[PDB]
Structure 1
Amino acid sequence: KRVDFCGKGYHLMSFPQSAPHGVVFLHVTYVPAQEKNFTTAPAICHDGKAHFPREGVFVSNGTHWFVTQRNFYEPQIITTDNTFVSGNCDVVIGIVNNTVYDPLQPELD
Structure 2
Amino acid sequence: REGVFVSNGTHWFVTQRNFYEPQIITTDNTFVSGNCDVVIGIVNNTVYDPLQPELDS
Q: TM-score, normalised by structure 2?
A: 0.95
The alpha carbon displacement at 1:71 in A equals 0.1
1:83 is paired with a residue whose SS is coil
Which structure 2 residue ranges, 5 or more long, are not aligned? none
Q: Relative to total residues, which structure has the larger strand share, 1 or 2?
A: 1
C-alpha separation between the residues in 2 aligned to 1:107 and 1:61?
29
Deviations 1:25-45 (A, max 9, x none): xxxxxxxxxxxxxxxxxxxxx
The alpha carbon displacement at 1:105 in A equals 1.2
After TM superposition, the structure 1 = structure 2 runs for residues 1-109 of structure 1, keeping only pairs within 5 Å, are 54-109=1-56
C-alpha separation between the residues in 2 aligned to 1:108 and 1:74?
29
The alpha carbon displacement at 1:56 in A equals 0.5
- Structure 1 or 2, whichever has the larger Rg, is 1
Runs (4+) of structure 1 exceeding 4 A deviation are none
The alpha carbon displacement at 1:92 in A equals 0.4
Which structure 1 residue ranges, 5 or more long, are not aligned? 1-53
Structure with greater contact order relative to length (CA < 8 Å, sep ≥ 6): 2
Q: Relative to total residues, which structure has the larger helix share, 1 or 2?
A: 2
The alpha carbon displacement at 1:65 in A equals 0.2
The alpha carbon displacement at 1:107 in A equals 1.1
Instruction: Quote the RMSD (CA, aligned, Å).
Output: 0.5
Counting aligned pairs with the same residue, the percent is 100
Number of equivalences: 56
Q: TM-score, normalised by structure 1?
A: 0.51
C-alpha separation between the residues in 2 aligned to 1:62 and 1:86?
26
The alpha carbon displacement at 1:100 in A equals 0.5
